Structures are given as structure tokens and as C-alpha cells.
Amino acid sequence: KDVDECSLKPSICGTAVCKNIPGDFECECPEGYRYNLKSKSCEDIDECSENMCAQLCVNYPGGYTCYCDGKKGFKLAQDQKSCEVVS
Ligand SMILES: [Ca+2]
Ligand SMILES: [Ca+2]
């Protein structure tokens, strides 16, 4: 390893069973679920909190989703990551 694994961010995976890297990580938590040592509980991750979605990030338990219909006010393409407008 290198440095800062499950303590790189305010709350990664409560250093439970996570495999962190210079700029990423893994965990025993479902999917890429995030864990907390404060609560010592397992909870879905914030895949969008990082930098994956566009304007809107409906991050569901496990697999996030990136729509938009916000500032511009449109819709979410068929990619489920990028957003596009529609009339
Ligand atoms: Ca690291
Ligand atoms: Ca999630």
C-alpha cells in the first residue's frame, strides 16, 4: 500500500475490510458500499458525491444514476450517466 486507505476521506469504510489505493478503494460492504466506524454500519456508497454525475445524481442503494433536469431543466439520456434535453 501507500498511505491513507480507509481514512482518506471523512468516512470511507471505517477501515473495516477495504482495499484502498493511491486514489481509490474497495470494501466488504455490498457493492462499493461505504462503511463507517462511527456507526460501524454498512451503507450504500456516494458514487456521485465524488465526481461521476452531471447535474443530478440519483444514487440508488449500490448503483448510482446520473440525470440532470436542473439548472438547464431537461432530461437524462439513455446512457444513465450523461444528461440531454428533450422537447
Ligand atoms: Ca491510498
Ligand atoms: Ca449508492
Curated annotation (Swiss-Prot):
Tissues showing expression: Plasma.
S-S pairs: C6-C18, C13-C27, C29-C42, C48-C57, C53-C66, C68-C83
Post-translational modification: The iron and 2-oxoglutarate dependent 3-hydroxylation of aspartate and asparagine is (R) stereospecific within EGF domains.
Organism of this sequence: Homo sapiens
Cellular localization per UniProt: Secreted
Highest taxon in the source lineage: Eukaryota
Residue window of the full protein shown: 200 to 286 of 676
Function: Anticoagulant plasma protein; it is a cofactor to activated protein C in the degradation of coagulation factors Va and VIIIa. It helps to prevent coagulation and stimulating fibrinolysis.
Coiled-coil intervals: none
Disease with which this protein is associated in UniProt: Thrombophilia due to protein S deficiency, autosomal dominant: A hemostatic disorder characterized by impaired regulation of blood coagulation and a tendency to recurrent venous thrombosis.
EGF-like domain boundaries: 2-43, 44-84
Protein name: Vitamin K-dependent protein S
